[PDB]
Subunit: 421 residues, 3 copies
């Protein structure tokens, strides 16, 4: 039985009082993690090679995830059964070294550690033919699925509230990788096409985006005993809302009172990313990220995002270090032109099982400080029926209420463990 996973768990306090709090800029899609995570999260994998005959083999893999608030011992929770798939390597003579798989599986996820941001992830139930050797590089094919809460209707109606049927979306993915465009550099290219797949006779709202495209290109260059990736992505319509490769072609959302509202996503998004990890000598290691993301929608409710931060680690011993992280966000509302921003600074003393910034288990003792000044927010007051601006970007003082997080300060501090096995 193979046992693997990820887990993070801990204890913390807030300067001003009570249990620890975490800071994320309103409008951004990520927070700088170090000493800024507030949950016990864990994935327990148990897989096993069930048959091998020479080169031919069949691997079985599973993954059950748990997320709890870590404010008590006995914490009950509905766990999520995220993967249960089978991969068969070399079973097809004519296309050697390639795998065929089917099942619920996390498929080639591309992410950015310090921000816990995943920029290319189409995982879900699915199937595919992986690593076909095309000579200059390796070609892979896959189809995965997702499905939005409602968004379809049993009959034509002008009433949005009639569109409460779960509406399924399909994604077709093609990638070409490990192409050595230069010395030390590699190039991957991928194309994603997603569409809402409707039941016989159901209909979507008028103006519903229905489908879309995602185009990815990533260059991986080896450097300073580390690496540096530079990405460029472009998405259209149904691919813009999630922006990782999954489609939401229905345009319909829901208030907590189950009333439907309209989150139409026709428009486009452009992402420019560069992140990496380099070692500069024997006593220093450092991770870094820089990004610019622009979601411009037809309905003027997009955003323009900027981030940068660095995590330099200095090693006193092969198992004791002092890690520090500094990050900055700035988000501008497409609808109002106002700007939200913040910056975080964390200082931690860790003990890892490795001489790397990439090595875990790690045990930390830390202190974090953050100052923000947010001038806009999302209007979620009311009901999607009571409110006509439900879900729209509005200024901080709109109609005398307060929107946004304010212009304030805070510091927290505590102890935590983190680990992938």
């Amino acid at each position: 039985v193979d046992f693997h996973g990820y887990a993070r768990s801990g204890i913390g306090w807030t300067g001003s009082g009570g249990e620890q709090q975490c800071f994320q800029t309103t409008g951004a899609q990520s927070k700088y993690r170090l000493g800024n995570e507030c949950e016990t999260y864990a994935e327990l994998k148990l897989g096993q090679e069930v048959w091998k005959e020479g080169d031919k083999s069949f691997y079985f893999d599973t993954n059950v995830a748990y997320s709890v608030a870590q404010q008590n011992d006995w914490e009950a929770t509905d766990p999520a059964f995220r993967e249960a798939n089978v991969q068969g390597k070399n079973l097809i003579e004519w296309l050697p070294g390639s795998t065929i798989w089917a099942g619920k599986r996390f498929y080639q996820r591309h992410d950015v550690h310090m921000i816990d941001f995943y920029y290319w992830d189409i995982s879900g139930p699915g199937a595919g033919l992986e690593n076909i050797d095309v000579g200059f590089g390796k070609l892979s094919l896959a189809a995965t699925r997702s499905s939005e809460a409602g968004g379809s209707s049993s009959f034509a109606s002008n009433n949005i509230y009639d569109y409460t049927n779960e509406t399924a979306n399909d994604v077709f993915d093609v990638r070409l990788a490990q192409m050595e465009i230069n010395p030390g550099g590699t190039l991957e290219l991928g194309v994603d096409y997603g569409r809402a797949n409707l039941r016989d006779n159901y209909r979507l709202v008028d103006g519903a985006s229905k489908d879309g495209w995602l185009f990815t290109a990533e260059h991986t260059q080896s450097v300073l005993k580390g690496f540096n990736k530079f990405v460029v992505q472009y998405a259209t319509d149904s691919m813009t809302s999630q922006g990782k490769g999954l489609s939401q072609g229905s345009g319909v959302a829901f208030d907590n009172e189950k009333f439907a509202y309209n989150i139409n996503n026709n428009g486009h998004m452009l992402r420019i990313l560069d992140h990496g990890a380099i070692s500069m000598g024997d006593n220093w290691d450092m991770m870094y990220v820089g990004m610019y993301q622009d979601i411009n929608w037809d309905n003027d409710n997009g955003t323009k995002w900027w981030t940068v931060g660095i995590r330099p680690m200095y090693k006193w011993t092969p198992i004791m270090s002092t890690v520090m992280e500094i990050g900055y966000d700035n988000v501008e509302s497409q609808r109002t032109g106002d700007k939200n921003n913040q910056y975080k600074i964390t200082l931690a003393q860790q003990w890892q099982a490795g001489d790397s910034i990439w090595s875990r288990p790690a045990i930390r003792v830390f202190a974090t400080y953050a100052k923000w000044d947010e001038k806009w927010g999302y209007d979620y007051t009311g009901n999607a029926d009571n409110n006509a601006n439900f879900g729209k970007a509005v200024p901080a003082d709109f109609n005398g209420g307060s929107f946004g997080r304010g212009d304030s300060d805070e510091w927290t501090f505590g102890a935590q463990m983190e680990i992938w096995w």
Copy 2:
């Protein structure tokens, strides 16, 4: 740590549109599985021999099941803790080779693969003395439990709605097996007696069945490098509703609005079964089933069921085959004499880890087609209070509404994995 289980997971599409659908005849208790399963289902077992001293040993066993819709990545679910038992072999000198066990355990289940039908299953919490050698065969004894949602009352009342207390049922099982009635053939005989066990002073409805019998006889004959089982079962009253060995002696049910209705089951059932798997040479394998089941109840709401189907596999290679399944159902309403029926045809190309129709992991690519013509259905419109025919078999056009599945067609197709380890 011993790791075992079962899991099935995949992706699919329906000809006419949307995610894949599955076909089961209204009134039948099973569907022909190949390319006709719509869930990710999985059982993860982790057991371990905890003590051995010679012949004497103690085994610990557990089983946690998960069922999800496989239409998304993160799918939370309440898992079911189905087994947690301890079996002690040879601990009793005077009755050698026998085991004593206690705990929640799946106990000697008899089922029919292609239809996923279990015809003899009394699993649940329980205890027993297993495999006592009686010379001509092996004798086993057990007591297991079940409990219906409500059906008991704290005081005598004429009001059904007063009978909302969980009512427990007990089962006492005795089997005698591995009797060689002929060359290559074996005979098992079993008797099940179930009864509702009431709390001091509680009462059941008038006319409540209260108890019942299940009688089983199964002959296993070795043939064509395979086998063929022929079963005959007979049940009375409380054993007729579930019809696998568990008792439901209260006769009370519940609408989604929690109103109680009366599903009295006095009557009887007779089942005739023959299924098996045979290899005809080196390039062909085939599974087959034939059944006739008649539930005749005192209230005229029974059914008369017929099924037949075959799954012949032809092997191109020791790991590539083409499997095909053809099945047919026909159910007649006891109350109305009308008949529902359907037939399915599936064609699949698989890759297994074996040269057997019985060997998994398996990875499939398939297409299924089904045509049905149902003339009767169950009336579930309304409320058990609003409706007086709530839950009764009624014709397709009864009071102008539509009951049944209709007279239609459809085809689906996709990819799936399946595996027991």
Copy 3:
């Protein structure tokens, strides 16, 4: 992968009718377990040493618990993710043999088997430095967390119902152990300080206890090839309600209708305990417990508790025994001076994997008998709004209703498995 746990599961019946019942004296905090447990409970641990370099190592540990009613096969449940921590041994040169850990962890629990009573348990999320060698003994330090459902308010109000905010409590623990005060004897001393940690600006009710102390001293003396522990504990205010080391400094509770009531706990508690297990020769083993616990609160609603019982085992064979348990409780209401009491006698024939009263797996067949005479109870009739005595100790016949369990009898009997691996 290391696999460990605990599990208990089984089947039972009640003399007078229905599924088995269990007996616990109203007002006591425990029941004598043998043949008196009514659930399938289980903890599955999967941990693993992930890195070792000489003396230095990092261990990863997890624990998922399941509790079900064992009255049916398929029993769905929300499981509780109770531990997920990392312990690093010898990572700090200057304080050898000591461990630093962080994460959700069960930390040094002290309990009494036959009554399933835990008398010193501060487990929960947390962190600490363990086993520092102080020469005469070993010194350990830790901080763990808990959090009450509500009890805090966003603004000052006189209305209790305004205090519905989850209010977090912190605990700071210090222990000094393995001090050989005598030949064969050891002494542990510990101090716990708990307090409610409020969010900036929140307030607690007036009179709220807010904090408290727990003082523990335990002497472990080796005897009759077994041991005997003698404990003395003293707690004040917020430490009195749970009385194991966790703080509940808010004083607010909640009716099932979510109305808040006031369970103020200013006061103190004193506990005197002595329990142990001794072998007297080769054919006898016996566990025993004696306790006196007095919770005296400012609001007159405390209790004065007394227990004693013994579990003597006689061994016919190295794997067959006859175990018997006899227990007695007597609880007196501080508010009314009335007394509740009961006594239990169980007789069982077991088969263990060991010649010890402490050895499992065990498989039992038993019969239990209990007679009680309760003269007081807690008033839970009504609503915390409807009722002004909601939650108070009141006599058995108060206002003509019946409170308490009565003056009665009963016997049950069945089969069960129990095991820690």
